């Protein structure tokens, strides 16, 4: 019964580990199924009301997109949103940022990152009047240095869109917003 | 273009 | 011993859930390994004879292809085949249909779906004499509405190829046929 | 008590089978996560010093890359490296080879394989003087016949780069090398 | 191009 209990304990712990690995693979699948390799990210954010509230309460201040890429072995990048705003936009705006991540082929890519970036909030209405802004990465920013940790300092627009505009327009629909990031890729090796 | 049954 | 039996029963249950979950990611891997994001589907159907007999016996009337896409965040679509035929081709033809599926990014895409679609069954013999049929989706068919359920009503060709032709030609080889769908992606966001 | 031991034994067995399948899926993820469909392979090889030594000792003579493809439903290919050389380069060279693998859509592709193939070792130093060698396949080699087994005979350059050259230059940063293979796809009718 | 061993 000592032995019987030992083995039952061993199995319970292994069954716990297997539940963890299975849950981590569900997340890995989701990342793969939403990957893109042409330098264009479409990010679908569901449960806006609940999530916007979790940023006001200070539970979850910001959200990250899945990674996306300039090519199959290009820059690894992603986007960061603050539904209740950050910096000069905290509490008054939606804040949107661009993030360089450490990719496996960084030793083969030009540094600093110099590709043109377009941030966008998609209009789900018939006008299709998308909000957007672009910039050319400043080469002196540590935002575009060759990554040394998992991600570089985010860079973008603290006052992208005022919350009042975003909530009274047609950007929100079925409690969902879409963010689009377009990285120009037409001056790099394919 | 016909539909399925 | 009642406690030992209870924990054994609890582990057996969790082992079954894991076995289901493992089997289900096997399918997910096969869907991901055959995904296509350039608007062209190649569909490999193995075990023709057995699956044809299954359709004749009424075991399995139709088969679905894996999904394919117009872009990384575009329309989700698939193909439907009736090996023993459907509608006006039941018993005499193979029927082949196009299916619009509910896509995660539907709120961003034009509806109704208006892209040219070509349905083909490939010639595996040296002639490369593929059977083909293109069509312009009729903007009023419910087959091309913004999906409300998982799949719209399929639309296509009930009398695509007569079975006698199919089985007397070079279309079958090692008990395998190949179906190709081409959706034209030239007039859309790139 | 005999009954309790029986069920523990069954559970242990099936936990062992799940531990393998999970290990297998981790590998399958990594294959998918590094897959490519435009005819260009980048192959990152870490732990060069330890792996070169494994070849000198005959533990692991050669390493294979993950598969890559000419299109979503095209040729399936990969690369084979000997860090301590093969044939007329054994012990003096790094040998780099190209492999045709059996692919799911082989019945649809031209055979023999005839696309131009470029093998390269990337220069991680700031000069970017990549070492490269191209070739047109010989239609009579069995290396480019329609596969009958998992892989054909490898074919390439037994004296691609001298080990002294390789290790004295700037091809090895952080005990890593990068191998690039470029297959020309611009003649392929999809 | 040459084959392997």
Author numbering:
A (entry chain C), C (entry chain A), D (entry chain B): 377 to 566
B (entry chain G), E (entry chain H): 36 to 40
Article excerpt on this structure:
ORF3a is a transmembrane protein capable of forming homodimers and potentially homotetramers. The TRAF proteins participate in multiple NF-κB signaling pathways, functioning as adaptor proteins and E3 ubiquitin ligases. They form trimers and interact with receptor intracellular domains and other proteins through their C-terminal TRAF-C domains. Since the putative TRAF-binding sequence in ORF3a is conserved between SARS-CoV (PLQAS) and SARS-CoV-2 (PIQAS), and generally conforms to the TRAF-binding consensus sequences, we hypothesized that SARS-CoV-2 ORF3a might also bind to TRAFs and thereby induce NF-κB activation.
